[PDB]
Design a protein around this ligand. Structure first.
Ligand SMILES: NC(=O)CC[C@H](N)C(=O)O
Ligand SMILES: [Mg+2]
Ligand SMILES: [Mg+2]
Ligand SMILES: [Mg+2]
Ligand SMILES: [Mg+2]
Ligand SMILES: [Mg+2]
Ligand code: NA
Ligand code: NA
Ligand code: NA
Ligand code: NA
Ligand code: NA
Length: 94
RNA sequence: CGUUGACCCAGGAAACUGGGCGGAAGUAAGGUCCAUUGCACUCCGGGCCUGAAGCAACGCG
């Protein structure tokens, strides 16, 4: 049941798991910095966290625009599925 | 691993202390086979193969 409550952070899944962590992070940044200031991008290839990423924007409006505009975009041959993060990210609790 | 140092962070009036920061390690990472659509921020699934680096220098291994 898709998370639709707006947030500073977007949650992305259905990411291609064969992409190297570093290259994935850099591609995500390239794709999303257009939408606004990104504080951070959290990427892990653990069993639990692979295929997934969190990109943290400074403004909520940036996250919203990023979410709406990049939905379903084919990224390393896989359509990105984007929702808002369920709860705030740490840096945003600061 | 040692020495003499550089830079960043926390604390300290300071001296400096603690990290970042070296043989680290069969680790991080990479290839493949299997498994996985998973809401995290304190790494981190399994097999086989491969496999690094402190910031500088010199010494040692
Ligand atoms: N990793 C290391 O311990 C490097 C040592 C090497 N002798 C050097 O001068 O850099
Ligand atoms: Mg001070
Ligand atoms: Mg010191
Ligand atoms: Mg030293
Ligand atoms: Mg050296
Ligand atoms: Mg020797
Ligand atoms: Na200080
Ligand atoms: Na004091
Ligand atoms: Na240090
Ligand atoms: Na691999
Ligand atoms: Na493997």
């Amino acid at each position: 049941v898709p998370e639709t409550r707006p947030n500073h952070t977007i949650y992305i899944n259905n990411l291609n798991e064969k992409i190297k962590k570093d290259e994935l992070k850099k591609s995500l940044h390239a794709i999303f910095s257009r939408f606004g200031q990104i504080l951070d991008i959290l990427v892990s290839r653990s069993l639990k966290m692979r295929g997934q990423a969190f990109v943290i924007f400074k403004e909520v409006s940036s996250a919203t625009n990023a979410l709406r505009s990049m939905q379903g975009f084919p990224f390393y041959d896989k359509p990105m599925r984007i929702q808002y993060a369920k709860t705030d990210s740490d840096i945003i609790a600061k």
